[PDB]
Design an enzyme around this catalytic site. Structure first.
Site: not given
Ligand SMILES: CN1CC(=O)N2[C@H](c3ccc4c(c3)OCO4)c3[nH]c4ccccc4c3C[C@@H]2C1=O
Ligand SMILES: [Mg+2]
Ligand SMILES: [Zn+2]
Length: 326
Positions: A80, A84, A120-121, A232, A285
């Site tokens: 993050h 990203h 957004h992060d 995202d 995953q």
């Protein structure tokens, strides 16, 4: 001064075309790009979405805002970080262009989605909402344990938008400015996966029952939230070598959080955050892809068939992880 040279270099550069920069491609990789080149790509995104012209953004101001956004990511957080955010914004641009979502949205929506994707992060600490709650962070107290990080990212977004020299929205009229900030808040909050899980059932049901209608403001807002999630999560759609490299970054971040949970909380981390149980990665995953990703990329393809490559890439990664898991 070091940040001044960065800005003067960026502002003096001729911005290459979107074609040259390959930013319309859903398979795009940032790995070979310098930080300056990611900034130039970002300027091109605002330019080719007609936002610079429309909202009369001064070039130097847009350049400064982009650099301020980039600086306010924590570079040593493994996943993050600015790359990203940049990738999220690039997926948004590709979805709007190659995916043909642009003409479904208003100018203000597109402006807000791009700003939100990049912002957004912001200032992400590399630990999850649950960790902040469990360590009694003041952020969790302020925000009542609800979308804690996302509230903080929004706060950071507003701080940068209001900072002298960075005011890329200073040219909007009062009604447009109000509207844009409301969309930005919703877009950033939508990136809390807990909100995606809470709201996606209604989205999927609308589609399944042939009730989906973007002319309904509530459904438009819901779609924008889903689109934020889709962007995202989009590393999970990339060609295998790209997705594998990014998945290693997320693992590094998550395992770092687990180390902190052992020390600070005296608890064994969940498998997702437990380096001692890294054997569980493939199966986790696959489980994530099946539970969270596939239905979203399927629904998005229903809205616009030209978004199919995201789903196709997602399916291919599922196959590759499952080959490791079995
Ligand atoms: C909350 N949550 C659950 C989850 O399960 N994941 C996945 C994942 C799966 C297995 C893992 C993992 C992340 O790190 C350690 O082993 C996963 N896989 C990615 C590939 C690329 C980019 C981000 C992710 C995430 C992020 C994502 C997430 O944010
Ligand atoms: Mg986030
Ligand atoms: Zn994110």
């Amino acid at each position: 001064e070091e940040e001044t040279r960065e800005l003067q270099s960026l502002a003096a550069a001729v911005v290459p075309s979107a074609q040259t920069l390959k930013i319309t491609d859903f398979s795009f990789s940032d790995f070979e790009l310098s930080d300056l080149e990611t900034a130039l790509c970002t300027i091109r995104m605002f330019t080719d979405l007609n936002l610079v012209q429309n909202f009369q953004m001064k070039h130097e101001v847009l350049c400064r805002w982009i650099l301020s956004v980039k600086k306010n990511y924590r570079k040593n957080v493994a996943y993050h970080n600015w790359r990203h955010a940049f990738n999220t914004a690039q997926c948004m641009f590709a979805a709007l262009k190659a995916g043909k979502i642009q003409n479904k949205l208003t100018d203000l929506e597109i402006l807000a989605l791009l700003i939100a994707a990049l912002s957004h992060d912001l200032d992400h600490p590399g630990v999850s909402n649950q960790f902040l709650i469990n360590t009694n962070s003041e952020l969790a107290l302020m925000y009542n344990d609800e979308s804690v990080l996302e509230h903080h990212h929004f706060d950071q977004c507003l701080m940068i938008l209001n900072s002298p020299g960075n005011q890329i929205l200073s040219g909007l009229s009062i009604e447009e400015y109000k509207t844009t900030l409301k969309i930005i808040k919703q877009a950033i909050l939508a990136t809390d996966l807990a909100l995606y899980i809470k709201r996606r059932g209604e989205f999927f049901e609308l589609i399944r029952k042939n009730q989906f209608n973007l002319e309904d403001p509530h459904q438009k807002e819901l779609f924008l939230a889903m689109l934020m999630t889709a962007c995202d999560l989009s590393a999970i759609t990339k060609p295998w070598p790209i997705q594998q490299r990014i998945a290693e970054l997320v693992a590094t971040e998550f395992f770092d959080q687990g180390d902190r949970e052992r020390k600070e909380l005296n608890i064994e981390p969940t498998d997702l955050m437990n380096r001692e149980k890294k054997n569980k990665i493939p199966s986790m995953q696959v489980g994530f892809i099946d539970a969270i990703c596939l239905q979203l990329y399927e629904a998005l393809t229903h809205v616009s068939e030209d978004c199919f490559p995201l789903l196709d890439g997602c399916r291919k990664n599922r196959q590759k992880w499952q080959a490791l898991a079995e």
